[PDB]
């Protein structure tokens, strides 16, 4: 995707300060709390009955780290997001049956989670660059659906 030099730099500098396991556990947990119908994919994960149970469930934290891990690897290949997520796009469609609209919901909770963690350093301009990236990633993941 086309990112200005200023947007690429903003995305990359902030991401160097992120602890990918913690932020991944938070983002996934908040997705399951704020949009509870997303729990239809995680029936085998244990107690998801309340916010505290969601946020403390170790299966939610281990999945979150996995998800953001592969997201993190996509930030190294911003010029070819489609080629980078092709394999995982096909997996999410043919084996997991995950509606791509959930990629968009997660991209917006992730932005909320960065703002909550970094405060006034997550400025308007920097949120703009991350909104383009999460929309680009959601796009790449839904690309092989059929």
């Amino acid at each position: 995707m086309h990112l200005t030099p200023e947007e690429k730099s903003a995305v990359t500098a902030l991401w160097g300060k992120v602890n990918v396991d913690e932020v991944g556990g938070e983002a996934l947990g908040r997705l399951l709390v704020v949009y509870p119908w997303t729990q239809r994919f995680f029936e085998s994960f244990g107690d998801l009955s309340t916010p505290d149970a969601v946020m403390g469930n170790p299966k939610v934290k281990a999945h979150g780290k996995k998800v953001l891990g592969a997201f993190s690897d996509g930030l190294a290949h911003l010029d070819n997001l489609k080629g980078t997520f092709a394999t995982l796009s096909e997996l999410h469609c043919d084996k997991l049956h995950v509606d791509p609209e959930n990629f968009r919901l997660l991209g917006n909770v992730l932005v909320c989670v960065l703002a909550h963690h970094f405060g006034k350093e997550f400025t308007p301009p920097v949120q703009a660059a991350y909104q383009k990236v999460v929309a680009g990633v959601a796009n790449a993941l839904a690309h092989k659906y059929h």
């Binding site: 509870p36 729990q39 049956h97 959930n102 659906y145």
Partner: protein, 141 residues
């Protein structure tokens, strides 16, 4: 909010649909699966080929519930209560997808009701399906 003219328009258009409601419900699901392929992620357990009995039974269940809401249009939350419960707690369809079915139902109705599908009835039908969608997703959270 459905006005009285909306309610009259919906009761007339659906009255004409009549005994084909079930066949129209199946065709709208088939139109949705081909135009908007991500909606097939909610039906992995179905044979989705043209004319499949599974699609024909889903089309007939949805038509019946539409008929019930037209009959109880002034009291829809109470009449669709069990359906909203099932969608919110068991099926958990993302609420984006309701707009896609609605559009496909409208295209189905257009294609079958040349004389009745006027601009004002089109407007009323679109508003009625948005309200049915709202009621069906009211208990999601």
């Amino acid at each position: 909010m459905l006005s009285p003219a909306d309610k009259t328009n919906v009761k007339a258009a659906w009255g004409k649909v009549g005994a084909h409601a079930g066949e129209y419900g199946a065709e709208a699901y088939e139109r949705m699966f081909l135009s908007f392929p991500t909606t097939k992620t909610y039906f992995p357990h179905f044979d989705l080929s043209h004319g499949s009995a599974q699609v024909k039974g889903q089309g007939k269940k949805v038509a019946d519930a539409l008929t019930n809401a037209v009959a109880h249009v002034d009291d829809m939350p109470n009449a669709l209560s069990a359906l909203s419960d099932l969608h919110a707690h068991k099926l958990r369809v993302d609420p984006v997808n309701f707009k896609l079915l609605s559009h496909c139902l409208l295209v189905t109705l257009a294609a079958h009701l040349p004389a009745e599908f006027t601009p004002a009835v089109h407007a009323s039908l679109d508003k009625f399906l948005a309200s049915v969608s709202t009621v069906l997703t009211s208990k999601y959270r």
